Design a protein around this ligand. Structure first.
Ligand code: SF4
Length: 192
């Protein structure tokens, strides 16, 4: 039967799409298997590729700070991954065939974890999860900052799209919006 350990083993040696040829390390994701909050980013950047870990660049440091200061959580208490788990060449966006190849890993991670909340960081992860939900995706600007109920198996999962933290690094206005969004995520997390 499936497990997060099995998914990690498969990802680390995966050659299911052409992205494998460009990587230093695949990035399977990390965190608590019973996380109430699951964060899903786009694809690994350069530092993520180097470390084999999600959100470790400057952007990841900001994410960590927001999780700590606004949500009141350590990274070990949440689960963090990416819709595509290898760094696209020259940091381009992932192709549709790459998302198709890799996203079953994310499906399997969600299946196992069944978080209360999935926070989709950026337009690619948001569009992907919306496609799985059957929810209409317009743009990240139009859908961010709202909760969407995803009836999934026996449970309800709250999907909360926001901007990717890298977008907030050098943009004070967008960072305040991201912070406000994390405040809303906090309220959702603590409310029965
Ligand atoms: S991006 Fe995903 S599907 Fe493609 S090689 Fe890496 S782990 Fe496999």
């Amino acid at each position: 039967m499936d497990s997060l350990e099995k998914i990690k083993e498969e990802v680390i040696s995966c050659k299911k799409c052409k992205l494998w040829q460009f990587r230093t390390n695949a990035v399977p994701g990390e965190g608590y298997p019973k996380a109430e909050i699951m964060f899903v980013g786009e694809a690994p950047g350069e530092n993520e590729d180097k470390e084999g870990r999600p959100f470790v660049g400057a952007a990841g440091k900001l994410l960590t700070q927001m999780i700590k200061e606004i949500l009141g959580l350590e990274r070990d208490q949440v689960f963090i991954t990416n819709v595509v788990k290898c760094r696209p060449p020259n940091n381009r966006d992932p192709e549709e065939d790459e998302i198709t190849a890799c996203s079953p890993y994310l499906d399997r991670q969600i299946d196992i974890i069944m978080p209360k909340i999935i926070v989709t960081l950026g337009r690619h992860s948001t569009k992907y999860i919306f496609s799985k939900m059957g929810e209409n995706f317009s743009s990240i600007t139009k859908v961010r900052g709202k909760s969407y109920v995803w009836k999934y198996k026996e449970k309800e999962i709250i999907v909360f799209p926001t901007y990717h933290p890298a977008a907030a690094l050098y943009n004070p206005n967008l960072r305040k919006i991201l912070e406000e969004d994390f405040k809303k995520i906090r309220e959702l997390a603590i409310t029965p």
